[PDB]
Symmetry: none
Subunit: 243 residues, 4 copies
């Protein structure tokens, strides 16, 4: 699915990623962790041309295509997904209306028939039901004490509704145990055999919440070590738990 080789990226003329290599195939959950600023977020921000850093070298292929070629919106069409923010107070454009426009934008790109207001309503009912999500998630409002996990419920819902091939997840930002708990839960609820996930995180704890297929340790823009979901233990036993 995804194959990154010798990736070199720069942000504000400064080297962040210095030759990263990483292969992701269908049905796998990869956990990437390590000391922040060492390349955990800019990596994820590169698989989606959202921000505009600069790839100095290396290659990134996605299903046999130069992913670095497409634009952020076109990578969405190809299957690469990353949670986004709903527009603010735009008359006529509710959260559900926009989610629906996003889903159809990708179906048409894919050459599929767009969903109407009703069959999309049916769809939203399913995922909200499958992910045991608050039925009024797209119009609800909550107290600051719930905001954490709330943004995340909205992120997973986008992931359920958008039928992504590979979803990038940046969980490095507050100690929210409830929020991390919704991330881990959504992913598990969304792990068939064809979808892949790249979860980036500094606070390595959600690992013991989803049981990744692979775990990679990132230091100064380079995967330094990687194994299964036991890697954490193998390290603390080999005398390298500090990593």
């Amino acid at each position: 699915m995804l194959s990154i080789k010798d990736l070199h990226v720069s942000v504000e003329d400064k080297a962040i990623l210095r030759g990263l290599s990483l292969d992701v195939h269908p049905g796998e959950v990869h956990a990437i962790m390590g000391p922040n600023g060492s390349g955990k977020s800019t990596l994820s921000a590169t698989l989606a041309g959202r921000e505009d850093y600069e790839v100095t070298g290396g290659t990134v292929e996605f299903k046999g295509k130069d992913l670095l070629a497409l634009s952020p919106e076109d990578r969405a069409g190809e299957g690469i997904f990353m949670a986004f923010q709903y527009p603010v107070e735009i008359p006529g454009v509710s959260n559900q209306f926009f989610l629906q426009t996003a889903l159809n934008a990708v179906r048409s790109y894919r050459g599929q028939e767009t969903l109407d207001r009703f069959d999309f309503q049916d769809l939203m009912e399913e995922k909200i039901a499958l992910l045991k999500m608050p039925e009024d998630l797209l119009t609800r409002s909550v107290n600051v004490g719930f905001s954490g996990g709330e943004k995340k419920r909205n992120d997973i819902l986008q992931m359920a509704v958008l039928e992504p091939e590979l979803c990038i997840l940046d969980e490095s930002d507050g100690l929210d145990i409830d929020a991390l708990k919704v991330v881990a839960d959504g992913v598990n609820s969304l792990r068939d055999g064809k979808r892949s996930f790249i979860i980036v995180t500094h606070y390595q704890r959600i690992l013991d919440y989803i049981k990744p297929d692979y775990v990679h340790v990132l230091y100064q823009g380079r995967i330094v070590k990687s194994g299964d979901f036991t890697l954490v233990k193998q390290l603390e036993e080999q005398g390298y738990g500090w990593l």
Copy 2:
């Protein structure tokens, strides 16, 4: 069409607006100024809709109706509008699609007939022609040195298309930008539409020349008058205000 009587607004239980009053009649341009933190921005957020603005007292009347009961989008429908930023980029869907949805949301509210993508496109192509802007303002991209002027360009366009009775423009954050804002407010000026511009400093008033100017200090309009007001204070040694 707009009358604000003794408005008290708080943000996170902190008092910002302390009894502000202001009337706005058709065909007028009011400029609201004052020392940053005087709440002149919250005055605009309050008229517009919310994020955390608690109206603790007072009234706000628009076209006779009670504005505060209304949601932001519905205020748009009622005729009071503040430019919005476009949603994240999505493949094969241009911002024209949302401008179109917004226009139809307001049209439905105002009891008028919606427009299909062909009818809308014509109406939009008409405005863009009047405001003489880049025919492709909704899909193109400009260097960072052009960001700002470009945002104002889009906003002004939204005003033209949604045709609100009262426009709220908050310029508290670029000579090029001041220019399109100024020029735009002068092209949408029809004698029946009104404007409330919140500016942090006296310059774009040199491009618009308001009917009224209002100094807001400590959460209250403390001094009003015509465009000469700015000079007045400047002379009496109150240039900071």
Copy 3:
């Protein structure tokens, strides 16, 4: 739910609806009004599918399907309903029999289990009880002075029993408080927040109903629209003459 775009309708080879457009979503109650010329009535006869109106242009979609390509009975099946008059009287058979038939036709269409004489008998009791109506509505006969509200009661029991998603009522009836209030109660009694209504009325029935939207029919085309306050707005902006 219901979307009508540029609808053109002819009757006696005479043009009546002329590019009428209107959307109705779940939970809404809409009112349609104007002179006896704008064919408020032919709009409702067209939605229900009365075999006598020619669609010449436009489109009608319900829950996403082309409603115009459906038979009257199948429309009720899709959830589109308008009260019907009971058949002529036949010995030994009660109107209850036909209502039971109408429900079973709609349930079959929904691929659901039809009810038997008894199960239906049960449900009808429940609806009569909850609507607080005469237990023998389907069989009793009444004095002419009552007939007016008697038909509205039957219309309402029909809606309750058939539970449509979009209710169409034609109140352009040839003015009598008794009946109107009965209608007003039924509507308010059938509002669940998900089923919608379209009320075509000649004249206060709006006052007791408080529709979420109002529309004026000017010779086959909808002019003004907006929430219930519209009727007062027009009355205050001088255009009182429109509605009535």
Copy 4:
């Protein structure tokens, strides 16, 4: 079969029939003629009991019983028939469906065996054949040019199907097509066995020339003034009374 003695009937309080007497026995066809607005039409509606009026005085016996004591429905079960309209668009209620159910309710009332959907279909085809009527008569639709006659074909078909003893046909409608008039003349001839009777009210026309009535009564001022046989019309049109 039918004995009407000194019948007085008022509509909306304006005396129409004023002591009308008539006897009709098995296998006779009786044409009622006379100036419009007169008792002829109110005579047909009083027998069928449909929206019946106010019988001030007199008696009506059918097969030995007081017909005026029976509801419109029981009288249909007793054997008296007058064409009716099929219920309009009630889900799961087609014309054939309704007919079958009207027939069965009449069979039950009579204590006879009812008919299931297979046996009914056969009676149906059977009758449609007999009358040489279109086979999709109960479902087809037609242009206005054929509107008039299409209605009588439906009335003639109900008549053949319901097995009536006494058929009442009201043909006092003006502007009727010659096409329509023929389907009724033909229908009556086809169903003219030697055991059922017919009362045809048709002064508005000339279908008598087609069916040869056994009796011809001329109704005037609410009373049967003169009556004879199929030649009575030339007898009156020989002695300048044609205007009757």
